[PDB]
Structure formats: structure tokens, C-alpha cells
């Protein structure tokens, strides 16, 4: 029936230019299409409505940058600068009445990922567990990520140079501003806290490694 | 044809 | 001025029924038709179904069919959709979006009503103040044990907005846990009450945790 279909990842050089292809199953090849933006915690965005002869419609809040096209069974979405902002997942959508009926369908998206983009190396804030905490024989270790991009980053903490697995949660990524934020916790007995000379908070990122480091003392 | 009918 | 203002997080034990709700403003809304969208697992959208308000004409996606309710009442200018004998698949983001009735264009869509189904204890944060560690100062606030998602972290009530960064939950066997940092100088902390308020809706809970010198 109606489908709609992308490449799930598609990555370009800052500043290059971008072509995203949403391809009409062969039966709706003369459809007109919508562009959307979907990027992260945010309610989607609405881009353009696209229709065959190349018509174009784009919606508020939009860039020059941004383009549309048609070549047949393809609809393309081309950003002229591919700026830092752009990256987000691009889904095209479709709307037609088979019978009485109204369907719309989504296709699967296109994660962008912008390339050759200069990093931003995570800062580390540890705290080490409250009086409180350590009064119920508990001792959260708090480990906060700060200012880093892109988003993947690898935690891990160490008991004085030995590895630690266990208690350990590490958060997913998010977005905050340009950067992204992360959170990883160690959780210990108050014994555990108290026995020994430090503790490590290390960050992997890019090839590059941040620690900070807790003592009991 | 497409048709938008809601 | 258009905007789409949807109900708060809901949770919803496994085998019961959810009402979200879509009220519209700055538009008429007979004149549009509502939309509504789930946020797919890993990336992208997956459409529910559409409601006319003025007919009450509904559409929906063929999966959705005895599993979604789409309403529209006239008067308060908002649109409703029930979701029934929910699993953990139906803990998602659902949005709702205005279209004409002549293209296919989801133009204004609303901030999204987080659905979580769980039989998991709903838990009140147990939390804990940072005190600095070792002119400026970084103190901390830490959130454990809480279940459902939301809470709500401010300082001072929201008094204290500048330099304030809280980071993302981590779950861990149905129990979240929360970190909240914020730097001040030495001249507001300790001489002024420095609080992390920790509002937890689910269990009807507000603490507020003064951070303390050691
Ligand atoms: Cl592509
Ligand atoms: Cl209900
Ligand atoms: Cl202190
Ligand atoms: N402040
Ligand atoms: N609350």
C-alpha cells in the first residue's frame, strides 16, 4: 500500500551540502509529501509540504538552506550549509483517502549526523556520599557529566585502580543547548565507602579519558 | 489521484 | 500564539485504560482537524488516527482499531484520545498535531504526554543533600529510589535559576535515581537557606532538602 522510504543514517561534512531521499512506493509516485525535523525531547517539527513538479511550501521558522525537489518516486530534502543545529532525524510523511478512509504514514526517518564537527571534552562534578546516606549503611557515589559533543561517551569507576562493576548506573545522553549532559552513580555499603583511599570517576570520550577522583579522607 | 478527505 | 497544551505524565497499571487530553488555543477549532502521533522506540513517528471535531468523524491506522478512542468536545476546545488494555508497548510519547482538512500537513503539534505502564511500587524520592566536596561553590542534591517519572527539581522553589544544571535519571529495577547540581558564590551559601525542592506527583510528595556546611 502507501509506503514510504529512507535510509535509517546519512552523515555530511559542515557546511557541505545535504541530499535526503524519501522514495513513494511506485503506485503514489505523484503524491505530495510533508518534511518534518525530529530532534531530541522536543515535539517533531514541521519542514515543508513537497509536491511532484518540485513545488515547494516550507513552514515557519525554517532556513533558506533548506530545499526541496522531486525526481519521479523521490521526494529530496537539501540543506545548502549543513550547519550543527540541522542534525536531527528527517521523516517524511503521506496523506490520501483509500475508500472513505483517511491514513497518513510516516517513513522511517533519517538520522542525520553532521561531520567534522569540532568536539567538546566532558567536565566532571563528583560528590561523595552525604552524612545522611551513610547513616542507613548506604553510599551513593554521584558522578555528573558536563559539556561534551558528540553525544557517546563510555563511564566507568574505579576502586583505588581496581574496576568496579557492580552499583554502577550510567546514564543515556542528553541534550542540553549544543552540548550534551550524562549522569553515572556507584552505589557501595558504607564499609565499602570507608575502606578504601579513593575512588575514580572515568569519562572515555572521543579517544580522549576524564577523571575526578573521591577520597574518605 | 490523492485525495485528502477528513 | 498557536498552541496544542496536552495532559501530564501518566501511569497506568497493565491492563487498564488512559485518557490524554489535546485542548487548543489562538485557532478555531472546529475549523482544523486534530491528529494524533506515537513517538516509535528508537526513531521515528507512527500515526494513530485523525478526529473531525465538528463531525466527530474518526479515522485511525488499522493497528489502532479497538485500541484508540479519538474525541473532540466543542465547547472546552479540546480532544481527548483513550488508549485501552495498555502493555509496556504502549509506554511511549503520544502527540497530538493540527492539520487542514485539505493536505497532509501536521503543522502546530503539542509538547507530548508521556505514557508509563508499570505494576511497579510508586516510590517517594528519598533525598539527600551535597554539601561542596573535598569565591564560587558547587552544591548538589541527590534524587534515590523514585517510581514513576516525573519529578519536578528547582532550587529555592525556582528562586535560584542561574547556574543550576540537572542531569538525566538513571533506572535501575523499577527505581529511578537523580542528581542536581548549581554553583553559588560564598557570600549567598551558607549565610542564605539553599534548598533542592523535589516534587514527586505520583505519591503526592514535595521535600525540601536545605544543603547544609559540614
Ligand atoms: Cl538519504
Ligand atoms: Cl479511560
Ligand atoms: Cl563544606
Ligand atoms: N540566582
Ligand atoms: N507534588
Redo the contacts with the bound molecule.
Keep these: 500500500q502507501l509506503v514510504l522510504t529512507?535510509?535509517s543514517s546519512?552523515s555530511f561534512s559542515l557546511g557541505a551540502s545535504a541530499?535526503?531521499?524519501c522514495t513513494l512506493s511506485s503506485q503514489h509516485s505523484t503524491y505530495t509529501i510533508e518534511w518534518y525535523q525530529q530532534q531530541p525531547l522536543k515535539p517533531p517539527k514541521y519542514v515543508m509540504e513537497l509536491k511532484k513538479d518540485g513545488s515547494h511550501s516550507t513552514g515557519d521558522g525554517i532556513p533558506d538552506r533548506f530545499s526541496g525537489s522531486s525526481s519521479g518516486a523521490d521526494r529530496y530534502l537539501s540543506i545548502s550549509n549543513i550547519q550543527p543545529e540541522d542534525e536531527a532525524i528527517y521523516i517524511c510523511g503521506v496523506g490520501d483517502t483509500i475508500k472513505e478512509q483517511f491514513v497518513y504514514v510516516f517513513g522511517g526517518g533519517?538520522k542525520v549526523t553532521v561531520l567534522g564537527q569540532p568536539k567538546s571534552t566532558p567536565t566532571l562534578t563528583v560528590f561523595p556520599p552525604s552524612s545522611e546516606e551513610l547513616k542507613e549503611n548506604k553510599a551513593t557515589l554521584v558522578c555528573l557529566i558536563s559539556n561534551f559533543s558528540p553525544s557517546g561517551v563510555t563511564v566507568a569507576w574505579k576502586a583505588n585502580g581496581t574496576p568496579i562493576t557492580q552499583g554502577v548506573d550510567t546514564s543515556n545522553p542528553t541534550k542540553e543547548g549544543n552540548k550534551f549532559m550524562a549522569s553515572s552513580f556507584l552505589h557501595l555499603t558504607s564499609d565499602q565507602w570507608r575502606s578504601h583511599n579513593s575512588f575514580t570517576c572515568q569519562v572515555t570520550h572521543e579517544g580522549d579519558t576524564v577523571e575526578k577522583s573521591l577520597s574518605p579522607a | 489521484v490523492q485525495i485528502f478527505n477528513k | 500564539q498557536v498552541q496544542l497544551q496536552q495532559s501530564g505524565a501518566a501511569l497506568v497499571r497493565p491492563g487498564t485504560s488512559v485518557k490524554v487530553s489535546c485542548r487548543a488555543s489562538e485557532y478555531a477549532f472546529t475549523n482544523y482537524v486534530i491528529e494524533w502521533v506515537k513517538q516509535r522506540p528508537g526513531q521515528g513517528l507512527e500515526w494513530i488516527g485523525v478526529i473531525n471535531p465538528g463531525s466527530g468523524g474518526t479515522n485511525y491506522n488499522e493497528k489502532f482499531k479497538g485500541k484508540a478512542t479519538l474525541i473532540a468536545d466543542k465547547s472546552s476546545s479540546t480532544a481527548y484520545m483513550q488508549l485501552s488494555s495498555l502493555t509496556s508497548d504502549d509506554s511511549a510519547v503520544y502527540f497530538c498535531a493540527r492539520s487542514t482538512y485539505y493536505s497532509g500537513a501536521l503543522d502546530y503539534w503539542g509538547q507530548g504526554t508521556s505514557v508509563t505502564v508499570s505494576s511497579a511500587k510508586t516510590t517517594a524520592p528519598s533525598v539527600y543533600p551535597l554539601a561542596p566536596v573535598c569565591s564560587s561553590v558547587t552544591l548538589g542534591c541527590l534524587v534515590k529510589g523514585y517510581f514513576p517519572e516525573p519529578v519536578t527539581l528547582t532550587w529555592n522553589s525556582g528562586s535560584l535559576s542561574s547556574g543550576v544544571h540537572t542531569f538525566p535519571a538513571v533506572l535501575q529495577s523499577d527505581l529511578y535515581t537523580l542528581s542536581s547540581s548549581v554553583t553559588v558564590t560564598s557570600s549567598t551559601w551558607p549565610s542564605q537557606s539553599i534548598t533542592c525542592n523535589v516534587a514527586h506527583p505520583a505519591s503526592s510528595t514535595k521535600v525540601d532538602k536545605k544543603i547544609e556546611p559540614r
Design positions: 529512507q535510509s546519512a541530499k535526503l531521499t533519517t
